[PDB]
Ligand binder design. Structure first.
Ligand SMILES: NC(=O)c1ccc[n+]([C@@H]2O[C@H](COP(=O)([O-])OP(=O)(O)OC[C@H]3O[C@@H](n4cnc5c(N)ncnc54)[C@H](O)[C@@H]3O)[C@@H](O)[C@H]2O)c1
Ligand SMILES: NC(=O)c1ccc[n+]([C@@H]2O[C@H](COP(=O)([O-])OP(=O)(O)OC[C@H]3O[C@@H](n4cnc5c(N)ncnc54)[C@H](O)[C@@H]3O)[C@@H](O)[C@H]2O)c1
Ligand SMILES: NC(=O)c1ccc[n+]([C@@H]2O[C@H](COP(=O)([O-])OP(=O)(O)OC[C@H]3O[C@@H](n4cnc5c(N)ncnc54)[C@H](O)[C@@H]3O)[C@@H](O)[C@H]2O)c1
Ligand SMILES: NC(=O)c1ccc[n+]([C@@H]2O[C@H](COP(=O)([O-])OP(=O)(O)OC[C@H]3O[C@@H](n4cnc5c(N)ncnc54)[C@H](O)[C@@H]3O)[C@@H](O)[C@H]2O)c1
Ligand SMILES: Oc1cc(Cl)ccc1Oc1ccc(Cl)cc1Cl
Ligand SMILES: Oc1cc(Cl)ccc1Oc1ccc(Cl)cc1Cl
Ligand SMILES: Oc1cc(Cl)ccc1Oc1ccc(Cl)cc1Cl
Ligand SMILES: Oc1cc(Cl)ccc1Oc1ccc(Cl)cc1Cl
Lengths: 274, 274, 274, 274
């Protein structure tokens, strides 16, 4: 495969429906040597079997909010793997309240919690493992249209992803010198532990399926393959790029209609709403 | 004037070169009643005469990192002016170190400092004064190209302005229901207290000057008129807009060369570099 | 006003609901000396009173597809006004067929007509009057979100507008040196002659009203006021800018929902579609 | 490979340095059965051997300016290959003058030639071959940063590329209904027949090399692999996307400076210019 002999660190796995898992699965099929991290011993209960299924004996603890966990991580991968060719940064969080209602009511607390866990953590993770990154290494993070466009109740998480994307741009220039790449994969809505916690997510998912050019929701396999590509030398001439894997949803300037032309009606007014 | 009888709150005045003042100056000539805020007593020594120079007796204290200041602001204007038609958010801060070197070396501390003072403050300032805002009210903040593009050692400030512009988008939806507008004016480099205290600023300035389409730097007056417009009814149809006042610089995909056709040479190699 | 003693050419008026009219009306109210053109004698019947109504006795014939009309035009304003401070390029066309169905069915013939009348015309109009443009002159054209986002059946006109926004960018660099500004005002949907001829235009309009941040359609006055600003010295620091005047519509990444939060319902499913 | 048993049409091969060839090469190594096309007999002398080396006996004539060639194409692929899984649209032309001097001097003639060969041809190519496109088919075209940013003397080609990306957006919606993908690969400067004939091209190249984050120029293999990715099921979740293979150049907001921080100096002022 295109990741043969390549070593990579996967951060974000919570279960087999995780974006990072789809990416790890895809990376595995291409011969990569993987390493995984887990937030707490409860998630490790799921990250471990997942890890075994992908020929990986490297499982470490890493709660991005605990700076000492980073110090341990550096020592871990340097001992167990010597070096890293790629990193997957698939982590984000914000209090449940922050994602409902408006951005106005956001508490300074929820703001910082979402900024730190979802943005700064990319900086700390990358700086921490910087001296262990081989030349040509690739750093991939996960974003969402909500960064540049308004998406119902995404709120502060929207402000985070915008900063996240900017960081990707600045990190690509900081590491470009040493031939290292940085990108963001902008996936469309998809069912995962984090999303199943968001209010009326089934709706966001229906609006995308019905109004997206390909008229479908992206699979975990599709997101995994786009990621794998971005992390492989297949894309060594690609950096500081925000790559959409959303069934083409990003192009829409309004609700789809194209299929119906009698008088032109919204596809929404005909599917799951009549 | 297009602001006669209109009441606005100006946040961000440090001296008479501040962007916030230019916009204030312009709104003044249009008949707006002005109100100013200062960070500390030291700054009040400069904000005071200015307010007086522009007919304003309503001067209040406001350090965005102090939440109790916000409740006072409220009571202060609710008592003095009763209502607000437009708010100017001209604030941004980050430690000196964070704006030099690389984004990678940024600390969790400077990060949270950059994000709070420069982004969350717009949220608290707005949500606080919300019930004092008349229908048709306009909220303007200031950003910089660094938000979506790499600019020399802008580092963490670039992440801030990226969330800032995204916050402008969500606030516009949050407050649009109530007929209120939220925009951002992305001004080009311009010499002010805060900018003069930034490494090699002389260079960013000259580069924009030579490479900009209008072949010059933007004046404080031009930024002020751009803002006055965004804050006047003249733009009642505008919202969630990042308005560029940069002498067209933002359109360049490389250094200028145009006038000289002989064999095409960078204007920079001909201007102040021979 | 901010256009006192300023002379500008207004191109594109068909009746009193035209965008070029709103722009004209607004510029008139600011002391501008206007001049108008007309496609044919039938439109001249409406461009004449309108022209009188705005203290303008300069009315010339101009069909952008007729190269000779441009030669007359130059001679006309050189005699009648000596010079131009601003220009309004408000012209667009494409066969009815091309604006329905898909982009795939567009004939080579419709493609060219749409590109010529809608894009090249800006190039010819500007290049022709270039010798009569005073320093600080401002060139304003009109575009629509369909340039960068897909909009129902906008098709080839979507391709035109995108080339047009890129044209705006290249012309700003070409004329930038001579202190001349070039911008585009991207207006939101609004009822006019050309639009009343578009299939199911009412829907585009309804959708914007319900889903736009300000929850209303933009008025002809708001478009004019924006254009006037773009054409006045008030924006002497703005160039190569695509300025949106759509009630904040461009920020939306999906249909509005906000006002209803029980389970978060689409405002569309509650307004003009129960 | 990821295109094993996948049949595609390669349009635009001029020699072993063409972008279309690199993509073909990368696709050939992924198991695809290829088919090529040539403009005139003078190019068939370079396409035939390339087609042979890549295992292809399907070499057809196609001058996008001639509509009859499209009818033959259809018949040629329907008879020789039965159906198509992917199409490569790597064609663009504009008169030599148009690409030098200013966009202002462009003639109506050259405007129409640029638009037609570089934009309309994507529309005819896809609509003609449409009945031969299998579900999940992928359509890829090539663009350049000049489409949305000013690039020296790119001029009218910049307008074409902007319409081209817009067409990619509308075509993606027209063919998505049938599960077909449409994307654009925006490559960075690279040595080809067409580019070699461009004014001051070495400069554009050195400028991207020094200012690009990965500090190099992209290779034909990288552009090739990026396109093969876009054209394979590996990217079945991506559509209407403009994908940048430019060593990350697009992220730059100004010239590079990074590595040097004595007073912060341009990398350009130190490399190939002292
Ligand atoms: N699922 C979607 O529809 C979608 C769409 C676009 C972007 N994304 C992005 O994908 C990433 C998340 O993937 P997901 O959607 O599969 O959710 P997920 O729950 O599967 O993964 C998120 C992971 O982050 C971990 N995490 C949370 N806080 C942490 C902290 N303090 N320290 C260390 N780890 C922590 C969680 O344990 C979890 O494993 C996020 O960046 C998210 O913004 C998701
Ligand atoms: N100067 C430029 O070239 C430029 C370019 C683009 C954007 N901007 C933006 O303009 C705004 C500031 O204007 P400026 O550049 O004229 O700088 P300035 O020095 O004139 O103003 C900065 C202001 O921020 C205030 N401030 C900082 N921390 C604060 C806090 N804790 N609480 C309350 N106030 C605080 C200061 O009191 C000061 O008045 C910022 O948002 C900045 O990002 C400036
Ligand atoms: N009305 C809207 O909702 C809307 C939205 C976005 C952008 N626009 C843009 O506004 C501009 C026109 O404004 P409008 O909507 O008031 O339409 P309108 O019908 O009022 O004006 C269009 C003008 O173009 C002129 N024209 C057409 N072909 C011509 C030719 N061959 N030679 C000379 N003139 C010709 C017509 O005579 C007409 O006066 C167009 O560029 C259009 O793309 C309109
Ligand atoms: N070379 C670069 O640095 C660069 C950068 C960005 C985008 N591109 C794009 O790549 C594509 C071309 O590839 P290239 O750069 O390798 O150049 P190239 O010389 O290798 O290919 C250009 C091809 O276009 C064909 N062509 C021109 N007119 C035609 C017509 N009327 N009918 C049929 N074919 C015609 C020519 O035969 C030629 O093969 C173009 O779309 C170009 O805009 C190139
Ligand atoms: O960014 C996301 C975008 C979408 Cl559409 C769905 C899930 C996402 O991811 C998250 C969103 C909110 C929280 Cl609190 C935590 C995570 Cl992991
Ligand atoms: O955002 C800015 C952009 C530019 Cl080009 C110049 C000055 C700016 O303003 C600041 C920069 C850094 C800090 Cl700590 C505080 C402020 Cl007010
Ligand atoms: O660009 C436009 C966008 C909108 Cl929403 C409405 C009208 C517009 O303008 C036109 C569209 C098509 C044709 Cl044939 C002629 C014109 Cl004047
Ligand atoms: O689009 C391009 C961009 C670059 Cl940087 C280099 C070459 C390109 O391709 C062309 C440019 C002009 C003409 Cl006439 C024909 C072609 Cl194929």
């Amino acid at each position: 495969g295109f990741l043969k002999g390549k070593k990579g660190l996967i951060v974000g796995v919570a279960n087999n429906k995780s974006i990072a898992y789809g990416i790890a699965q895809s990376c595995f099929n291409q011969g990569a040597t993987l390493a995984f991290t887990y937030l707490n011993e409860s998630l490790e209960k799921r990250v471990r079997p997942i890890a075994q299924e992908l020929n990986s004996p490297y499982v470490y603890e890493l709660d991005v909010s605990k700076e000492e966990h980073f110090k341990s991580l550096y020592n871990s991968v340097k001992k167990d793997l010597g070096s890293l060719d790629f990193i997957v940064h698939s982590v984000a969080f914000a209090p449940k309240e922050a994602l409902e209602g408006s951005l106005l009511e956001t508490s300074k607390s929820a703001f910082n919690t979402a900024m730190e866990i979802s943005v700064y953590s990319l900086i700390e993770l990358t700086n921490t493992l910087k001296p262990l990154l081989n030349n040509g290494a690739s750093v991939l993070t996960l974003s969402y249209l909500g960064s540049t466009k308004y998406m119902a109740h995404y709120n502060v998480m929207g402000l985070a992803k915008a900063a996240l994307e900017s960081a990707v741009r600045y990190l690509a220039v900081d590491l470009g010198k040493h031939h290292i790449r940085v990108n963001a994969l902008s996936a469309g809505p998809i069912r995962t532990l984090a999303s199943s916690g968001i209010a009326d997510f089934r709706m966001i998912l229906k609006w995308n399926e019905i109004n997206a050019p390909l008229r479908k929701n992206v699979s975990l396999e599709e997101v995994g393959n786009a990621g794998m590509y971005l992390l492989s030398s297949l894309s060594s001439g690609v950096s500081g790029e925000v790559h959409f894997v959303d069934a083409g949803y990003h192009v829409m300037g309004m609700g789809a209609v194209e299929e119906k032309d009698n008088k032109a009606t919204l596809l929404w007014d005909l599917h799951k709403e009549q």
